[PDB]
Amino acid sequence: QDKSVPVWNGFSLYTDDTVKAAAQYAYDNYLGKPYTGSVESAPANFGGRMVYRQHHGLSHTLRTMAYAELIVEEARKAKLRGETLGKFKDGRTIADVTPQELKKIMIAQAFFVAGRDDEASDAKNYQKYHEQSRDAFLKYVKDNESTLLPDVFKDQEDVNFYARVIEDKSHDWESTPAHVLINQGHMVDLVRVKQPPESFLQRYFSSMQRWIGSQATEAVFGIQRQFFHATYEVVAGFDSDNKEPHLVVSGLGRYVIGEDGQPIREAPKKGQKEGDLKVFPQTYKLKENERLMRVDEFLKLPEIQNTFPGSGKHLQGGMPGMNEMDYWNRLNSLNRARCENDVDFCLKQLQTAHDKAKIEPIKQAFQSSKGKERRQPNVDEIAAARIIQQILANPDCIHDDHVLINGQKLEQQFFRDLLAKCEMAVVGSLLNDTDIGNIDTLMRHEKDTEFHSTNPEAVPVKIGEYWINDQRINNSSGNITQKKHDLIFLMQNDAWYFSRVNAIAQNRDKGSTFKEVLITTLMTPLTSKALVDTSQAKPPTRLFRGLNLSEEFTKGLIDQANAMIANTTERLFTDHSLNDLSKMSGRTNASTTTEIKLVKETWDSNVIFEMLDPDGLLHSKQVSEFSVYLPEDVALVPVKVTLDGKTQKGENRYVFTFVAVKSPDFT
């Protein structure tokens, strides 16, 4: 076996302009148009906007194209792990598809159902609609020969073949990657809707598995679920205990259980311990003591259980961590209609989901370290936060020497008690932005309240006026993050304020009025909250580092990246359990930048490390340029390798993309 795979050239559905434009034309000219036929063709309304083709529309189409990218990706990975994939007649496998091929396929995919006039499913209409699809495709190419011509499709003959795949006449069927990726991506999109779902899933699975193997096939179906979430469509449950009749998908038939209580089988061919399961039509009349095989019975058959990882499993439907009511609303949202009518938006959703799906399995592969633990607020602190919020919101409760709020008279000592005994950072974490906004409320009411420095000769200041004027001029839009900033500023800079506040907060003040005590009690937790909510300084999410490597050495590192990438797959039913690369990517260093142009145009680096830091695990420091430290327990795990053109001299330029991950297991 040869586990070689050629290096990808950067091609993707999400970033190629030709493909995008092909989908856009498919939308504008076909998929976004009302159906003109009568079969099950009513437009559907999602959050108030119409989706004219909710089954075979834009989102469906784009999903089929994302599936092609995902299938080829998981096939390549399977070949790299050393598995033996199904072969076409020419000896190729799906792991051998090139970017130039996949791009022709995606463009063809864009028009695969453009030709449908409604949802009629009989064969005379299938054929007409696929002829109409073919014409659409061929019109597209004619109108764009110039750019598509030599550059995407070799010649008309090449164009004519993809046109034939779309037309899908049986006498044109071949085992080719185009034929198979197109039919497969198309049919797997039905998992979202068809019932019983266990029946359809096992069929579609077993049909993919023969091309790409079982572990890849789990990845493709696992990720598909995320694509459905991303495009605001239903994610189906999977129950291995489902009691309804099994549906024999091809032929829409059934299996029958006889009087013995056993499935009826065809006489056994030789070297078969048991005969083939006899497929009956739905018009077959059941005898007495005869019934249909249930889904659960089916999945428990040794021949299915031997071969399908979903036997004995369960997948909850919908979305992990949402209500039914929210989930239902999410499916019925404007976001569904946007996906269905806006190419850019829908591609972006799938993109984001596809990128996340490469990182998430890399995270599940290691014990994440236990984040810090935190005491709950005690009842006093919750009560302190309540009463501050109420005072802020109802400042007319504030009088010269006390607050009167819930039948009680709150005097000076009460607020000093809050400061002495509640932990004000904790109090401050119970407070919210509406509370920050009510600083204005308080300050308006207290406009001429005098706030006195600890300096006896200082002029008393009118804090409310101070606050309020300053906010009208410099934060007139009422912007709340900015109020946080301004409140910190006041605490840091104006000693007439901070001196009295700190003196009271430390119980060593002298000649403090009641209002000063009160105001100190209110502002201190708010200021705490402000520091905290504005000091969340985020490390950049995406960095680039430039290197200058012999192409030989580079190939070394490719083989190692391929080997880590190939071993991490999204699962569906089954589980999970230091290189030249890990040393090289990991060493602390200074030729880093957030600007890709720096790395390419200016430095002309022939090898680029792209570092993704979604979780901000990388200690970095600016020397555009930058220097990066890897915490001991943080590792850069490869996610992707590709050829990204050439340098100015003409040498191949490679990009290795890594993701920063935190684990005890590293150190």
Tell me the CA distances in angstroms from 575 to 137, 443, 566, 568, 635, one per residue in order.
42, 58, 15, 11, 22
* Least Å from the CB of residue 414 to Hg ion: 9
Alpha helices in 143-256 (DSSP H): 145-152, 156-167, 177-188, 197-212, 214-230
- Nearer to Hg ion by Cβ, of 18 and 305: the residue is 305
Per CB under 5 A, contacts with Hg ion among 555-574 are none
Instruction: Name the segment binding Hg ion (CB under 5 A); options: 87-95, 173-181, 418-426, 597-605.
Output: 418-426
Residue at 104: amino acid letter: K
Q: Which is nearer to Hg ion, 74 or 118 (CB)?
A: 118
- Location of structure tokens 């974490």: 429
380 binds Hg ion (CB under 5 A): yes
Instruction: Check the annotation: does 493 bind a ligand.
Output: yes
Q: What type of residue is 177? A: P
- The minimum distance between CB 553 and Hg ion, in angstroms, equals 47
Tokens found for residue 39: 């079969």
Nearer to Hg ion, 121 or 146 (CB): 121
Convert residues 277-316 into a mask of x (bound to Hg ion by CB under 5 A) and - (unbound): -----------------------------------x-x--
Minimum distance between the CB of residue 424 and Hg ion, rounded to whole angstroms? 9
Alpha helices in 81-176, H assignment, sequence order: 99-110, 123-142, 145-152, 156-167
Contact pick of 72, 78, 418, 584 for Hg ion (by CB under 5 A):
418
Q: Total number of residues binding Hg ion (CB under 5 A)?
A: 16
Which residue's CB is nearer to Hg ion, number 575 or number 632? 575
Question: Is 11 or 200 the residue whose CB approaches Hg ion more closely?
Answer: 200
Q: Return the residue of 291, 363, 402, 485 that touches Hg ion, per CB under 5 A.
A: 485
Measured N-to-C along each axis, helices 58-80 and 551-565 cross at an angle, to the nearest 10 degrees, of 110
Q: At its nearest, how many Å lie between Hg ion and the CB of residue 299?
A: 9
Tokens of 662: 């935190």
Nearer to Hg ion, 521 or 606 (CB): 521
Say whether residue 154 binds Hg ion (CB under 5 A).
no
Least distance CB 289 / Hg ion (angstroms): 27
- Measured in residues, the chain has a length of 667
CB of 283 to Hg ion, least distance (A): 23
Q: In sequence order, what are the residues at sequence separation of 6 or more whose Cβ sits closer than 8 angstroms to the Cβ of residue 166?
A: 108, 111, 112, 130, 133, 134, 137, 182
397 binds Hg ion (CB under 5 A): yes
Which of 567, 562, 654 lies closest to 605 in space, CA to CA?
654
Segment 185-244, which members bind Hg ion (CB under 5 A)?
239-240
* Preceding amide of 196 cis, omega within 30: yes
Among residues 279, 304, 393, 488, which is the contact residue for Hg ion, using CB under 5 A?
Answer: 488
Where residue 96 falls (left for φ over 0; alpha for ψ -120 to 50; beta otherwise) is alpha
Contact pattern from residue 437 through residue 476 relative to Hg ion, giving x for each residue in contact according to CB under 5 A and a dash for the rest: ----------------------------------------
Query: Residue 358 or residue 483: which is nearer to Hg ion going by CB?
Result: 483
Stretch near Hg ion under the rule CB under 5 A, chosen from 174-182, 348-356, 486-494, 557-565: 486-494
Q: Whole-number minimum distance, CB 125 to Hg ion, in Å?
A: 11
Tell whether residue 251 is among the known ligand binding residues. Answer: no
Q: Which stretch binds Hg ion (CB under 5 A): 250-258, 391-399, 549-557, 578-586?
A: 391-399
Smallest gap from residue 181 Cβ to Hg ion (A): 15
Residue with tokens 């469906």: 60
User: Judged by CB, which is closer to Hg ion: 73, or 239?
Assistant: 239
CB contact at 8 A, 593 and 624: yes
By CB under 5 A, name the one of 102, 163, 422, 431 that touches Hg ion: 422
* Planar angle of CA 621, 625, 626, nearest 5 degrees: 25
The 3-state secondary structure of 571-609, one letter per residue: CCCCCCCCCHHHHHHHCCEEEEECCHHHHHHHCCCCEEE
* 446 known member of a binding site: no
Q: Which residues contact 306 (CB under 8 A, 6 or more apart)?
A: none
Q: Are 519 and 392 in contact (CB under 8 A)?
A: no
Query: How is residue 460 annotated by DSSP?
Result: P
Site map (CB under 5 A) of Hg ion, residues 314-353, x = contact? x---------------------------------------
Rank residues 24 and 64 by Cβ distance to Hg ion and give the closer one.
64
Residue at 531: amino acid letter? L
Phi and psi at residue 178, to the nearest 5°: -55, -55
Stretch that binds Hg ion, among 358-366, 392-400, 518-526, 656-664 (CB under 5 A): 392-400
Asked if 131 interacts with Hg ion (CB under 5 A), we say: no
Residue from 154, 421, 472, 542 touching Hg ion (CB under 5 A): that is: 421
- Alpha helices by DSSP H, listed for 422-513, are 424-429, 433-445, 463-474, 480-493, 495-505
CA distance 188 to 180: 12
Residue recorded with tokens 């309240």: 449
Q: Are 237 and 196 in contact (CB under 8 A)?
A: no
Residue nearest to Hg ion (CB): 422
Closest to 639 measured CA to CA, from 618, 597, 611: 611
469 annotated as a binding-site residue:
no
The least CB distance from residue 442 to Hg ion, in Å, is 11
Contact 19, 347 (CB under 8 A): no
CB of 193 to Hg ion, least distance (A): 9
CA distance 141 to 166: 14
Cα 68 to Cα 17, 102, 224, 597, 609: the distances in Å are 17, 8, 11, 31, 27
**In the complex, minimum distance from the CB of residue 420 to Hg ion, in angstroms, rounded to a whole number:** 8
Residue 393 touching Hg ion (CB under 5 A): no
502 is in an annotated binding site: yes
**For Hg ion, the closer CB: 16 or 380:** 380
Least distance (Å) from Hg ion to the CB of residue 311?
Answer: 9
DSSP letters for 132-151: HHHHHHHHHHHTTHHHHHHH
Tell whether residue 332 is among the known ligand binding residues. Answer: no
Q: Where in 494-513 is the site for Hg ion (CB under 5 A)? A: none
Using CB under 5 A as the criterion, which residues of the chain lie in contact with Hg ion when the complex forms? 40, 239-240, 312, 314, 380, 384, 396-397, 404-405, 418, 421-422, 485, 488
Tell me the binding residues.
493, 502, 506, 508, 545-546, 548, 625
Residues making up the annotated binding site for NADH are: 493, 502, 506, 508, 545-546, 548, 625
